[PDB]
């Protein structure tokens, strides 16, 4: 329930590692990467003048 700006993501991954273990944090990292890529492409943010 935040903006997840490259610092909340790191903290969330750290809590997942320090709470659950190693396999769940690996699967979580892969899922985060995939969903981020898909939704960044869907948004279509572009830089104009």
């Amino acid at each position: 329930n935040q903006a997840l700006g490259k610092k909340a993501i790191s903290k969330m991954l750290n809590t997942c590692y320090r709470i659950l273990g190693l396999k769940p944090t690996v699967i979580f990292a892969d899922q985060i990467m995939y969903t981020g890529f898909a939704y960044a492409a869907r948004s279509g943010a572009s830089v104009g003048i």
Binding site: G21, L22, K23, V26
Partner: protein, 74 residues
């Protein structure tokens, strides 16, 4: 396929000795004179030895007592 060896690590905790144990088990099953105790999923003997350790059926003491048993047999 064992993508993570965390459980095998914690079964016998060194992250350094399990390499030796798995190497010994793989040599036994690859050179000859051994058969896997877990079902073979057409994978290499490396992950088979690691899965054997993960299930808890192979460690240093068990391997040593088995070797003693075969030496006594011959």
């Amino acid at each position: 396929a064992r993508v993570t060896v965390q459980d095998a690590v914690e079964k016998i905790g060194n992250r350094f000795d399990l390499v030796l144990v798995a190497a010994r088990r793989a040599r036994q099953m690859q050179v000859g004179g051994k058969d896997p105790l877990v079902p073979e999923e057409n994978d290499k003997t490396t992950v088979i030895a690691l899965r054997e350790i993960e299930e808890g059926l192979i460690n240093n003491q068990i391997l040593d007592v088995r070797e003693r048993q075969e030496q006594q047999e011959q």
